Amino acid sequence: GSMQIFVKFRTGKTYTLEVEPSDTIENVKAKIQDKLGIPPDQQWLIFAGKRLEDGRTLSDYNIQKESTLRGVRRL
């Protein structure tokens, strides 16, 4: 299945993103690249005070539809 979540950047700008619970964090990064043009290696995704790990899924992190990730520039 699919759901909508949100990604909020430090500018305050918040964007919809269409994901699946089975998506790995790297796949979610891949979606942000298509929509916004940010390569995955310029991205960190934070939720619940943690940096989310590649190889884990949204379902593993218990991230609910209409939740909000923070998007952070990886340096």
Swiss-Prot record:
**Signal peptide stretch:** none
Q: Which gene encodes it?
A: UBB
Role of this protein: Exists either covalently attached to another protein, or free (unanchored). When covalently bound, it is conjugated to target proteins via an isopeptide bond either as a monomer (monoubiquitin), a polymer linked via different Lys residues of the ubiquitin (polyubiquitin chains) or a linear polymer linked via the initiator Met of the ubiquitin (linear polyubiquitin chains).
Q: How does it sit in the membrane?
A: Peripheral membrane protein
Q: Which residues carry this modification: ADP-ribosylglycine?
A: 2
Where's the Glycyl lysine isopeptide (Gly-Lys) (interchain with K-? in acceptor proteins) crosslink?
Answer: 2
| Descriptive protein name | Ubiquitin
- Out of the domains of life, which is the source? Eukaryota
Processing after translation: Phosphorylated ubiquitin specifically binds and activates parkin (PRKN), triggering mitophagy. Phosphorylation does not affect E1-mediated E2 charging of ubiquitin but affects discharging of E2 enzymes to form polyubiquitin chains. It also affects deubiquitination by deubiquitinase enzymes such as USP30. Mono-ADP-ribosylated at the C-terminus by PARP9, a component of the PPAR9-DTX3L complex. ADP-ribosylation requires processing by E1 and E2 enzymes and prevents ubiquitin conjugation to substrates such as histones.
**Ubiquitin-like domain mapped to chain residues:** 3-75
Q: Localized where?
A: Cytoplasm; Nucleus; Mitochondrion outer membrane
